[PDB]
Amino acid sequence: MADAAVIEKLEAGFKKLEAATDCKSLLKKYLTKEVFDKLKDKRTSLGATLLDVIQSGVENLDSGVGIYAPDAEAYTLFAPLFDPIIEDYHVGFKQTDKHPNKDFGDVNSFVNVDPEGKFVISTRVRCGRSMQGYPFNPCLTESQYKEMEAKVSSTLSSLEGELKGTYYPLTGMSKEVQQKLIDDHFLFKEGDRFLQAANACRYWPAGRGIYHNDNKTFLVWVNEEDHLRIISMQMGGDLGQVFRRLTSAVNEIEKRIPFSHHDRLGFLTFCPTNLGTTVRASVHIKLPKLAANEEKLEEVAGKYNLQVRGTGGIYDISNKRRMGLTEFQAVKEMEDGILELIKIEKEM
Ligand SMILES: NC(=[NH2+])NCCC[C@H](N)C(=O)O
């Protein structure tokens, strides 16, 4: 399986994880000596090793999770490490569960959670897709990066109506175009230490790109962390409008680019935190009263299965659940939770 030199670095990595008595990553938690020993010499048919899985968590001890899938096969071959980490991270996605098939449900039925625009500055729904036939970042060749870019660029550039827009490859992009995209918060940068140590950024910026529509309500990142990160956003709180746009776009893309998908895990993504629906429906929202006590905000959000992140008392608040529920259900959890959070804010 894995080359002797790889196994050697794996042994050193296991020791580092043991050295880090302070470490709280799911990687440390589930990479017992037993599981390590059984997996350390294995290799997928494409050549991915346990090192290609855990290197990021070894290098960055402060990782929360600390593993990534280098190809789809890795989810199966290294299941003894992936499965419990997935179970632990995706709370409530049980051993006996399977992630449901795609179901966007009635996309137009979602409401404006803040019609007055008093709390929510903007609403965004994102998903991620891997492209069928291509492995994840660390197993991609330069040629695959470029071929993927060509296919995606051609597909996106043929979108019409609301979705009509412009594709910009990162390669050779001028500073002026960079500033324009930065000003709209459309540009992504080369991946951070977690992605670097996962070998997720090889050949950067080759095959990396950004697309947005004329209206600036639709944004796609190509080969940032996943092959496709697909995002619908607009000012205010109309989650119905946002989700409808996203689903329309994802459906249109799928006609030309089939996606990698798994019977149990749902849509396959590079990081296992993004599996299942992959959906992250969020508001950027100002809740000055509830934010007087950050710990209280966190507690209340969690009660309604919401996650609080950065994004001046302005929070990115999103659905916490990704696996074991439909896309419709995930957006609905965000919808209902935000409605309830706003009520709490008003009444405090
Ligand atoms: N962008 C992400 N996939 N974030 C979640 C994982 C981040 C990093 N690998 C960690 O374990 O903390």
Q: Is the beta carbon of 318 within 6 A of some atom in ligand 1? A: no
Taking the C-alpha atoms of residue 104 and residue 328, their distance in angstroms, rounded to an integer, is 5
- 309 annotated ligand-binding residue: yes
3-state helix, strand, coil in the chain (%, to 5): 40, 20, 40
The number of C-alpha atoms within 13 Å of 207 and in the hemisphere containing its C-beta is 23
Task: Kindly give the number of the ligand 1 atom that is closest to the alpha carbon of 66.
Answer: 11
- 65 annotated ligand-binding residue: yes
Strands 306-309 and 165-169, by their bridges, are: unpaired
* Token pair listed for 21: 């008595």
* Token pair listed for 35: 């599981």
CA of 66 to the centre of ligand 1 (A): 7
Q: Are 200 and 270 in contact (CB under 8 A)?
A: yes
Q: Which own/partner pairs from 15-23 qualify as long-range (CB within 8 Å, at least 24 positions apart)?
A: 16/58, 16/61, 17/57, 17/58, 17/61, 20/61, 22/61, 23/61, 23/62
- Measured CA distances, 177 to 171, 174, 180, 182 (Å): 12, 5, 5, 8
- Resolution of this PDB entry, in A? 1.9
Taking the C-alpha atoms of residue 134 and residue 303, their distance in angstroms, rounded to an integer, is 38
In which element (H, E) is residue 240 found? helix 239-256
Per the DSSP assignment, residues forming a β-bridge with 258 are none
Q: Is the beta carbon of 192 within 6 A of some atom in ligand 1? A: no
Q: Which domains does the chain have, with CATH numbers?
A: 1-95 (1.10.135.10), 98-348 (3.30.590.10)
- 311 annotated ligand-binding residue: yes
